[model samples]
Target chain A: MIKLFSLKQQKKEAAQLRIQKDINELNLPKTCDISFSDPDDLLNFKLVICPDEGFYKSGKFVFSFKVGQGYPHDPPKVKCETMVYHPSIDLEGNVSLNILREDWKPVLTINSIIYGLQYLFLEPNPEDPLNKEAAEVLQNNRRLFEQNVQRSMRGGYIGSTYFERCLKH
Target chain B: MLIKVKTLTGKEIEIDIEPTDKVERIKERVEEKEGIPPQQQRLIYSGKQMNDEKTAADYKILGGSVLHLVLALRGG
Candidate 1:
């Protein structure tokens, strides 16, 4: 039993070390910031992205990153913490970035994920979308799409759905 | 003291700076090495955006600290 416990602990520590290295090498964007609620818990952290350009300008979007013990081999589970109105991100915070799913590789770091999330705000992918309605709106009428984005970001109702305010003051 | 500056493109560069040096000084050094203009570089330390007027000491930056360099883009 003791040997089995030690082996599990060793694996946990090894995963922790890998996560530490990835975080230490992080190079985040200017509009983005990362925070850890508990300094000792490197497995979980929050990322805040405040885009200065594009349709999501001045909107503060938050994401929660949960790095599993099988990390590097498996991509971190990244979910949007903020309720956003975008094609690539759904109301439940399900993000549609390819690298977070099928395209993830062992070489990809947390930095790569951050850049990918930032790009989602810069240019939301309409063709591949988590929110089909949002994607359709963006494809059909860009002017109407822009207005919906503005309305949702300002904390109001769009059709029957209500969005929380996410705009940065 | 020596600090590391990592760019968004996954490039890392080491810079020699003083604790008393302003954030702009570091931006200048990055420009000298990477050819990115000081105005276009936005440095971040410990999850907070570094102000150009603030010194490294102001942000409690120490030797071997890692700073993130993000390019500032102009909107059309």
Candidate 2:
């Protein structure tokens, strides 16, 4: 009785509507802001974050999230559009968030993921890391890691990888 | 007992708790400071997760031993 087309489009719209409502009610942190990649589609969005503290402090990083297909039931696939050097975020821009993976549940809202991403900047977890070098530096050489973070954020090269300066207001 | 707790952020906090305290009890301290709740905490000692049913003394945690407070890296 259920065609695959409606199944796909219907579920997508249903989830999109729920997420749209969630977006309007979002209590995003003061340092974070979001916008859609295409104004016509809510499925693709960009998040701009300016961490208040930690290694990524004052650095402007943009993350893109694709909320397609299963959502609320399945979390969004988020990636950093801006290249970054962090323990949890790989140089390729893959964001390592718990709630977006095995810990995700239908009960959890978009608000939960938003806060989690914000918290990652506040404290970049080094225990389970996407960037082992960054994690090791963070664990062993705190001063050097801090220097690299600041240098990278200032649009400088950290060991040959040149980063564009992105300090946000 | 003053237990040296290490966070993923590389911050260290020496906390004083009784050896008889439960895992949940220790988690509350981390929660207050780190703001990550007990549900999100993955308190690791001796490369193993310390569950709420266990006691601090049960795992032979000493006064100066290091406990890694790892947040749940991946959600369910």
Candidate 3:
């Protein structure tokens, strides 16, 4: 995640306002956990997602966020450091959360993003995909896709890369 | 149009938007368009995330939206 140095007063003020809004209006599901990696670093943090009711029933997915000083107007970049099988989020660790793209708003906060991400796990959209292979498999064979996810979470191979189980909580 | 960006980490970014693209919408796509990991990078609009609660309707975007995202990577 990108950090800032000597931000202009306006920039600093804007960031502070956004943080305040996030604290006041955060609404996360039971399966999602979000926190600042550093007390001072508002822009950088971890997003832990455990989908208890989706295709990823027993997997823990961790993502990182780096917000720039120019935030709100710009979308926060999101990637899954963990390798897994999903249509929206790819092995390169990119995600298709709308807010990070067309859904972005300067007023949107941290909680909003986490919910959006959790939605992806619950409903992995094949319509817009980063991993074409995963999308194809999902589109063609639902059962096979499920098996592949399970295999990858169990610390095995999903085609080429190996994934470790984060143990869904 | 595709918008290209770079993180302070020097990671390259790319974004694609159609002619009918909304300003706010384009900003959000900047996150993935650059292919930066959600874990390590974010996009602050030349559009400015904090300015006037920028929604898609607030600004007008053109072809090839290039930007710079600083890696404010925080650790526990």
Candidate 4:
């Protein structure tokens, strides 16, 4: 006899199948990499992004993604494991992306989220910011923001905020 | 009238539109330039979603007005 699962079960199946497909077909851009946190668990994974341009250029930033059991029904939860200076990412390492929250839909894939995260580094968004101070700096003083990013990347102090070395080298 | 539209990526695209212009027409134009699909594009003016059936003048959209663009889905 064949076992019949519910539609939600089928939804989960579809999401897992998509992830499996991505493993073989997803080709990330240069200086961006993805790996599973646990070989057995396809949900938890780590992404490393090294921006080639922008204020955060030549810096290595790591992010963690936790795909819930809800799968395609909901978006994945992403967090910055490595602390860095950014307009959107908070000091606690929360990376806020609209697609991961209110704008999320079933059709969205993991590749889309990767691209969104990578774009955050390339062009820091000051609108609807999570890090208010960083946003202010980015919006008001572009030069100061550049200096802060440089100082933070090299493991120095920026207004009493101590940052570790995150340089690509 | 010229309106400033802001993308989710924080890029601003200034579009010249008229009161008689259909919201969907602008969506097509935005799709052409921004690559965001018309169906996925949710144009928000003053925190409200603009209806495609309505004309730009119906909402009193004027020159120098800023419209925020929200995405309902990712582009294929």
Candidate 5:
């Protein structure tokens, strides 16, 4: 029993060390920011993306990353904590990025994931989308799509679905 | 206390600073080491940009805190 406990502790430490290494070497853009609720808890952290210029300009979007023991071998469980209107991100905050899915590699670090998330804001992919309605709007009518983005960001109802104000003051 | 500053190039520079020190002090230190001018340096901590006039204490920066340093280059 003691041996099993020690083994688990060792695994946790290993995962922590890997995450720490990745974070220490992070090269983040000015629009992206990272923070930890508990500084010591390297396994869990929050990322805030404030797009300077894009359809989501001046918006503050938050994402939570939960790194598991599988670590580099497995992609961190990433979830959008903010309610955002985007083709790639669902109303439920599930992001549809290829890197976070089958395209993820063991060599990819947290920094890579950060860039990927930022890119989604800069260029929301309409081809493979989590929110099909948003994707359709983006593809069929670009002007209307832009309008919808603006309406949703201002904390109002977009076709009965209310989105909280995510615009940065 | 010691804080880690990560640059855009993925380089981490450890700096010794006091809570009472102004955020500009960090810019100066980075200028001296990396040769990047103070004007080009922008320090950010906890998702907020650190103002030159504000002390580290004002931003609640503590030991082991990691700050991101972004460089402002004109004309892209």
Candidate 6:
């Protein structure tokens, strides 16, 4: 049966609505904050993580996500905005978190992804990395990696990029 | 030094870095910070494995190094 408007448009609208509902239910952590950037564009959102403990405890990391029209079928595209030394997030900002890739489910909401990013900072996996060197450092010489992390956070030289202190508020 | 970490919601942790005194250790820091066991953790470095038993010295963590880490949930 044919409906009134474009089925594609209708479905897209419905999905957008559902996404909003999903995000709202996420109940994001106080350490994190998000903004649509545009009220009309829910597919594009930004997330910030401020850890209260560990190597990244006092630092703030930012991530951006964009969901395609193929959402439920295709995973939302997530990228780390702030550079950090970890196993899962590559130098190119590509994250290795599974939920962002193969593990994603329609039932899962933005909240899930938010937790996933937070988890990445707390637990970096060197087994499946986008940036291998970072993994090696994190795997072998932990002290160096931790020092590098602190240095980078304090606005020191990290290979090429310079990171200003992003202590959590 | 052992680092204590909590999840976004303070739900579960040590999921990224585990605590280790190795010369190069940040992935473990992220996992152990999140409270994830090394055995249960799957660390990746530039599409390869920094892997278990292999210390960061085994790999090269140059300046401005970035890596991605993840724990398993469910996937093909």
Which number leads on DockQ?
2
lDDT digits (tens) for residues B1-76 of candidate 6: 2222223332423223323434235544564455545555544443333456565545554433434344443211
Best candidate (score: lDDT)? 1
The CA lDDT of each predicted structure is 0.81, 0.75, 0.64, 0.77, 0.80, 0.64
Off by over 4 Å in 2: A1-15, A37-40, B1-76
> Across residues B1-76, which tens digit of lDDT does each residue of candidate 1 receive?
8998876546789889889888899999998998878976667564445788878898888877988765432111
lDDT measured at residue A155 in model 4 versus the true structure, 0 to 100: 96
Per residue, candidate 2 scores C-alpha lDDT tens digits across A1-169 of 6586777777875547867765765546567788875777877788888887677888788888888678778788988888777888888878888778877766555556666776677666678889898888988998998898888788888777897787876
TM-scores (chain A) of the candidates? 0.90, 0.86, 0.84, 0.87, 0.90, 0.83
Q: Model 4 off-target regions past 4 Å?
A: A1-15, B1-76
lDDT of 6 at A12: 78
Q: Fraction of native Cα contacts kept in each candidate?
A: 0.00, 0.17, 0.00, 0.00, 0.00, 0.06
- lDDT of candidate 4 at residue B68, scale 0 to 100: 63
Full ranking by DockQ: 2, 6, 1, 4, 5, 3
Candidate 5 per-residue C-alpha lDDT over A3-66 given as tens digits, one digit per residue, 9 for 90 to 100:
8877887897664698898888666778888999899889999999998877899899999999
Q: What is the lDDT of residue A143 in candidate 5?
A: 92
Compared with the true structure, what per-residue lDDT tens digits does model 2 show for residues B11-37?
Answer: 678887998888788888988877777
The TM-score that candidate 2 achieves is 0.64
Cα lDDT of model 1 overall?
A: 0.81
Indicate the fraction of true inter-chain contacts that candidate 6 also forms.
0.06
Docking class of 4: incorrect
- Writing each residue's lDDT as its tens digit, candidate 5 over B17-36 gives 99999999999988887788
Which candidate, 1 or 3, has the higher lDDT? 1
Model 6 is docked with a DockQ of: 0.06
Candidate 5: deviation at residue B67, Å?
Answer: 19
